[PDB]
Enzyme design. Structure first.
Site, PDB file in Angstrom:
ATOM      1  N   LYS A 118      -2.088  27.123 -25.474  1.00  0.00           N
ATOM      2  CA  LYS A 118      -3.054  26.048 -25.695  1.00  0.00           C
ATOM      3  C   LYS A 118      -3.181  25.709 -27.174  1.00  0.00           C
ATOM      4  O   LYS A 118      -3.341  24.542 -27.539  1.00  0.00           O
ATOM      5  CB  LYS A 118      -4.411  26.436 -25.114  1.00  0.00           C
ATOM      6  CG  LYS A 118      -4.463  26.427 -23.595  1.00  0.00           C
ATOM      7  CD  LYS A 118      -5.899  26.521 -23.106  1.00  0.00           C
ATOM      8  CE  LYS A 118      -5.980  26.355 -21.596  1.00  0.00           C
ATOM      9  NZ  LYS A 118      -7.392  26.356 -21.122  1.00  0.00           N
ATOM     10  N   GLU A 202     -18.933  22.512 -32.259  1.00  0.00           N
ATOM     11  CA  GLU A 202     -18.206  21.434 -31.606  1.00  0.00           C
ATOM     12  C   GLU A 202     -19.165  20.310 -31.252  1.00  0.00           C
ATOM     13  O   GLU A 202     -20.363  20.365 -31.548  1.00  0.00           O
ATOM     14  CB  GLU A 202     -17.484  21.929 -30.342  1.00  0.00           C
ATOM     15  CG  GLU A 202     -16.357  22.904 -30.613  1.00  0.00           C
ATOM     16  CD  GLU A 202     -15.307  22.324 -31.540  1.00  0.00           C
ATOM     17  OE1 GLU A 202     -15.041  21.104 -31.453  1.00  0.00           O
ATOM     18  OE2 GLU A 202     -14.754  23.081 -32.356  1.00  0.00           O
ATOM     19  N   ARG A 295       4.205  18.844 -14.634  1.00  0.00           N
ATOM     20  CA  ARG A 295       4.569  19.184 -13.266  1.00  0.00           C
ATOM     21  C   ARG A 295       3.970  18.144 -12.332  1.00  0.00           C
ATOM     22  O   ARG A 295       2.880  17.620 -12.591  1.00  0.00           O
ATOM     23  CB  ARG A 295       4.068  20.582 -12.893  1.00  0.00           C
ATOM     24  CG  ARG A 295       4.523  21.083 -11.540  1.00  0.00           C
ATOM     25  CD  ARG A 295       3.587  22.164 -11.027  1.00  0.00           C
ATOM     26  NE  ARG A 295       2.224  21.673 -10.838  1.00  0.00           N
ATOM     27  CZ  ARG A 295       1.226  21.892 -11.682  1.00  0.00           C
ATOM     28  NH1 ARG A 295       1.396  22.595 -12.790  1.00  0.00           N
ATOM     29  NH2 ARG A 295       0.024  21.389 -11.409  1.00  0.00           N
TER      30      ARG A 295
END
Lengths: 678, 85
Positions: A118, A202, A295
């Site tokens: 990530k 954040e 995918r």
């Protein structure tokens, strides 16, 4: 380019049949794969050839990528489609396929490896310039730094902590110009939750709704983004119901979602089909990147109902084979237009009343909803199982997918309702009742549902119809008749018949009594929960004389006196009676009455147990003192002229030894007392 | 306006099946009515639920309007189509 005539599939289930079908239209060969047994499964009955791979555990089956590659080489396979799961996300497997020379279907190995971590992925998107909401900025070096970037990097304040979900440092402090409470909140969070003193700030979003656009790319530098999607409804990170046309989404936004998505895919480089996922807050009005998947999703046929290319139906898997062909595209982003709305729902072989635990059992009767067009709506069902099949515990519980395309949302939602109702399965409890409850009472027909939408309405849901005393009457009657000639040819003297059934509904036994008056098998009565009435019953053809685990499936008719009439297809077994009709489906458990029928001994067993004859000389005792002995093991072995003659006592309860090995004992001595465990 | 989810039919025959069919497309429930016996008839095998009403003579069957109305109220019916006759 390279010709393809043989197609290989990795996984099993609905995707196997889907990949196999279109293949027929392209006129290409097919190959199937199956685990130990698993040979009666449908997909193998759909392919041209199938190969067994090995033991049921997923480590043993569908994970030996090297063995799969060697087998494919021996078969001279042209292409492999991994599908989703197993080796769907493994760059080593794709690289080995490329080295072997087979056209892998999907992204290159580099993209999969990069998106595996990530941190490096978010690094790549941050370099690309896509609006991304990060997880962290630096650390809590200074408390004044918190005020420095509080109004700087991210005005919304997400205090939280370095780790842990307690989040008491948050305090839902959405008010800026906060400087005397944020530091106090963080310092009180540090207490008893010290962890690491580093703190990350954040942006905090009050609301969250998930978005995910689709994309497609050839290998000749040309692509086009498909329509958006919504996955707001999910329980415990499991997809439940989704909508390809995000209701309440402005056209202009749709357009832009594409420009952002194409930038990210081009930056990493991409070939084939994929999906970018966003996270969105209505109050802010902006979307921030969360994750992408390299995918094909499971939700591909859903978005299809809301997109047409050059006025023709779109097939997502088709293009992926054509992408592997090396041919370039034929359409710009323009040729694709949306038409109407559609909704989807997944059915899981789990029990809603329980902890959504999967159950494995044979599939007795499977109703199939009308998969044809009628009115202003299209409804389809795709199932990876059929009649006579059995669910495997190793696999995930997944039966079928139902999709209701329509010209308007209303039509689509209304369509499903009826379809969801119509589809019926007998043998294993399902969540189909839950989904219908999720659709009727919740006023989500408006179209605004958050990510946590399921959490608040849990009280309202998890509700099923109440078993009326009448339902017991048809259910009880079926078990008799669907087992024997009860009430058939019966006869007594100057009296009348009687026969009773015991149901273990919930944790309370239920008794139902049935009897007749006159010379009529037809006229029948009932008395359950102190409620009495009359009805007549007319059966159908007698079937399933072998009365196996599936037992007997027959239709029934019941004319109750009030005036009604009913039709009930009852597959009854000793364990339970299942009745399906206009009421719905209900399975009633029969009161269990089993308990070592025979060996029911409460005798004290005080003395004179496993007594040995005169010679004695006990030795080699292999039983521990004070251990339960229900099965007749050799408690003591005594030898009389080479006569082991083991006693082999079967008295239940722990056995207490009063002798030791090698001790000569007299005739009929109390070697041990076999007493009930107290 | 008033929502409809249950449809009631009075008469029997071709009209019963016709009224029942389109109903499927509108996605609405159905109810059937039948005289003494007359339970193997097709229309009842087409509906969702059927109720016996009484003796064969037309005075006894399909003319007890009050009884039909009481039964429909007990079923909480939304609409009734008498048909012809």
């Amino acid at each position: 380019e390279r010709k393809v005539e043989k197609l290989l599939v990795a996984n099993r289930g609905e995707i196997a049949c889907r990949v196999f079908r279109t293949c027929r239209e392209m006129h290409i060969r097919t190959v199937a794969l199956f685990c130990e047994a698993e040979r009666n499964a449908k997909h193998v009955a759909e392919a041209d050839e199938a190969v067994c791979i090995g033991p049921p555990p997923a480590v043993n089956s569908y994970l030996r990528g090297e063995h799969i590659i060697s087998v494919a080489k021996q078969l001279n396979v042209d292409a492999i489609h991994p599908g989703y799961g197993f080796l769907s996300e493994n760059a080593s497997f794709a690289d080995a396929i490329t080295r072997s020379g087979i056209e892998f279907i999907g992204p290159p190995a580099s993209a999969i490896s990069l998106m595996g971590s990530k941190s490096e992925s978010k690094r790549i998107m941050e370099a690309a310039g896509v609006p991304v909401v990060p997880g962290y900025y630096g650390e809590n070096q200074n408390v004044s730094f918190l005020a420095e970037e509080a109004k700087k990097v991210g005005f919304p304040i997400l205090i939280k902590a370095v780790s842990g979900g307690g989040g008491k440092g948050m305090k839902i402090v959405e008010r800026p110009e906060d400087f005397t409470f944020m530091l106090e909140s963080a310092k009180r969070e540090a207490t008893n939750f010290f962890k690491d003193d580093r703190v990350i700030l954040e942006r905090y979003v009050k609301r969250s709704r998930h978005i995910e656009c689709q994309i497609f790319f050839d290998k000749h530098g040309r692509g086009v983004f498909f329509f958006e999607r919504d996955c707001s409804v999910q329980r415990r990170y499991q997809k439940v119901l989704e909508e390809a046309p995000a209701p309440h989404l402005s056209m202009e936004t749709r357009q832009r979602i594409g420009e952002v998505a194409l930038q990210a895919a081009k930056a990493v480089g991409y070939v084939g089909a994929g999906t970018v996922e966003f996270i969105f807050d209505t109050s802010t009005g902006e979307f921030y990147f969360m994750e992408m998947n390299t995918r094909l999703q499971v939700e591909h046929p859903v978005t299809e109902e809301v997109c047409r290319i050059k006025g023709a139906p779109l097939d997502l898997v088709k293009l992926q084979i054509k992408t592997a062909m090396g041919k370039p595209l034929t359409f710009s982003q323009e040729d694709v237009t949306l038409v109407g709305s559609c909704i989807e729902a997944r059915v899981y072989a789990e029990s809603p009343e329980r902890g959504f635990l999967p159950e494995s059992g044979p599939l007795t009767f499977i109703r199939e909803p009308f998969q044809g067009v009628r009115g202003p709506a299209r409804t389809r069902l795709d199932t990876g199982f059929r009649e006579g099949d059995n669910v495997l515990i190793h696999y995930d519980p997944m039966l079928a997918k139902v999709i209701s395309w329509g010209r308007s949302r209303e039509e689509a939602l209304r369509g499903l309702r009826q379809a969801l109702g119509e589809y019926k399965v007998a043998g294993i409890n399902t969540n189909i009742e839950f989904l219908k409850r999720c659709c009727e009472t919740p006023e989500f027909a408006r179209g605004g549902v958050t990510t946590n939408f399921i959490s608040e309405h849990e009280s309202q849901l998890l509700k099923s119809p109440v078993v009326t005393p009448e339902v017991a009457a048809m259910a009880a009657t079926a078990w008799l008749l669907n087992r024997c000639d009860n009430w058939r040819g019966a006869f007594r003297l100057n009296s009348d018949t009687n026969a009773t059934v015991h149901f273990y509904i919930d944790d309370h036994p239920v008794e139902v009594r049935l009897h007749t008056e006159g010379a009529n098998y037809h006229k029948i009565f009932f008395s359950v929960w102190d409620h009495d009435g009359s009805f007549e019953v007319c059966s159908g053809p007698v079937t399933s004389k072998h009365r196996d685990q599936k037992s007997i499936v027959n239709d029934f008719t019941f004319l109750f006196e009030n005036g009604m009439h009913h039709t009930v297809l009852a597959v009854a077994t000793e364990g339970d009676v299942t009745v399906i009709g206009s009421f719905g489906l209900h399975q009633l458990r029969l009161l269990p009455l089993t308990d070592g029928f025979g060996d029911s001994s409460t005798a004290g067993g005080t003395s004179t147990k496993i007594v040995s004859p005169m010679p004695g000389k006990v030795s080699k005792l292999l039983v521990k003192s004070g251990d339960l002995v229900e099965k007749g093991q050799v408690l003591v072995i005594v030898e009389a002229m080479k006569m082991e003659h083991p006693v082999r006592a079967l008295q239940d309860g722990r056995v207490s030894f009063l002798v030791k090995e090698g001790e000569v004992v007299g005739g009929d001595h109390v070697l041990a007392t076999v007493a009930e465990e107290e």
